[PDB]
């Protein structure tokens, strides 16, 4: 029947443009299946990095009668993208910011048709914003939201004919999310402060001068924005 997604991925789906979705490291092709069942996209590519998710995606596409509309591919990151593909959206979800960043940078040659990027980061989204900036991408929307008590960020970006430089605060906190600072922004960064002060409970100041200087600088950045 109709697939139901979690709220994190449902929220991602609301940023899809019409056409093709390429879901990278897909969670068993459910986001592409949902997108087609709901008429958000026409066609899909589901990239799966290892055999288990690959085999599951193949079975799920077949079970939903979408074998002619979603192409399930085995490969890491953007390695699955083929030269003849027409891709309107690349989605990369359920990963840390640093991994999404690495996928985009390592795969940058696959971005020539300038698709919309919809990235859903679990942690440390700074790295992905730094990479987007390097790739002539511009953040056009951001969401911060909570599901099952965990806070997730969604970053929506499109290609710009000039590189868009972000400040240190915009990279760390988000150029859109800074404009709003919703209850989930405050909760996320309160939690991150608690984690940084907790690290200070574990590191002797005589033995960790360099590392503690970095932690204290980061605390001061967050305390200024809250």
Numbering used by the authors: 0 to 225
The authors write:
TrmK catalyzes the transfer of a methyl group from SAM to tRNA, producing m1A22-tRNA and SAH. SaTrmK is typical of class-I methyltransferases, with an N-terminal domain where the cofactor binds and methyl transfer takes place and a C-terminal domain likely involved in tRNA recognition. TrmK is essential for Staphylococcus aureus survival during infection but has no homolog in mammals, making it a promising target for antibiotic development. To shed light on the structural basis for cofactor binding and help inform future structure-based inhibitor design, crystals of SaTrmK apoenzyme, and the binary complexes SaTrmK:SAM and SaTrmK:SAH were obtained, and data were collected to a resolution of 1.3, 1.4, and 1.5 Å, respectively.
The electron density data for the SaTrmK apoenzyme showed clearly defined density near the active site that could not be fitted with any of the small molecules involved in purification or crystallization of the enzyme, suggesting it was carried through with SaTrmK from protein expression. Intriguingly, citrate could be fitted perfectly into the electron density, making polar contacts with the side chains of His27, Tyr29, and Asn59. It is possible the negatively charged groups of citrate are mimicking the phosphate group(s) of tRNA. DSF analysis indicated that citrate leads to an overall modest decrease in SaTrmK Tm that only becomes noticeable at high citrate concentrations, which is incompatible with the presumed tight binding required for the interaction to continue from protein expression to crystallization. Therefore, the significance of this observation, if any, is still elusive. In the absence of tRNA, SaTrmK contributes no background luminescence, as expected since the enzyme is not purified bound to SAH. This is evidenced by the crystal structure of the apoenzyme and no SAH detected by LC-MS after denaturation of SaTrmK which would have released any bound SAH. Superposition of the three structures revealed negligible effect of cofactor binding on Cα root-mean-square deviations (RMSDs), whose values were 0.15, 0.18, and 0.08 Å between SaTrmK and SaTrmK:SAM, SaTrmK and SaTrmK:SAH, and SaTrmK:SAM and SaTrmK:SAH, respectively. A superposition of the active sites of SaTrmK, SaTrmK:SAM, and SaTrmK:SAH shows there is local motion of some residues in order to accommodate the cofactor.
